[PDB]
Nanobody, 124 residues
């Protein structure tokens, strides 16, 4: 069975920090780029962070640059999103996904590499 199992999230005050994780099962985690994206009701989806297989390449949405850090531990099959300096505009459902270097989703059975999502809310 293949899954990317997400955890973390919650409600914090502006300036707060949260760490999200996702842990892969049933697929080789180290073979895939992973990303975090978020979606709020009333805002469109946004990829906020991308990490390459080895973790050597990380890219960030400008809006989270220097506040969020994507990292991974291939040994633990786990990708992280460290979200520091949270702001109200960070409020959203956050999802991790394994994908390709080009794309947020894998080419097939993409739902198998997609975290269920966790709410992150930064109170105003």
């Amino acid at each position: 069975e293949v899954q990317l199992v997400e955890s973390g999230g919650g409600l914090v005050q502006p300036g707060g920090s949260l760490r999200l994780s996702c842990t892969a099962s049933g697929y080789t985690f180290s073979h895939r780029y992973h990303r975090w994206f978020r979606q709020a009701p009333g805002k469109e989806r946004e990829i906020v962070a991308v990490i390459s297989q080895s973790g050597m390449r990380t890219y960030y949405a400008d809006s989270v640059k220097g506040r969020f850090t994507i990292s991974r531990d291939n040994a633990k099959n786990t990708v992280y999103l460290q979200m520091n300096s949270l702001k109200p505009e960070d409020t959203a459902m956050y999802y991790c996904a394994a994908g390709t270097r080009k794309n947020v989703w894998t080419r097939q059975h993409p739902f198998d590499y997609w975290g269920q999502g966790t709410q992150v809310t930064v109170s105003s």
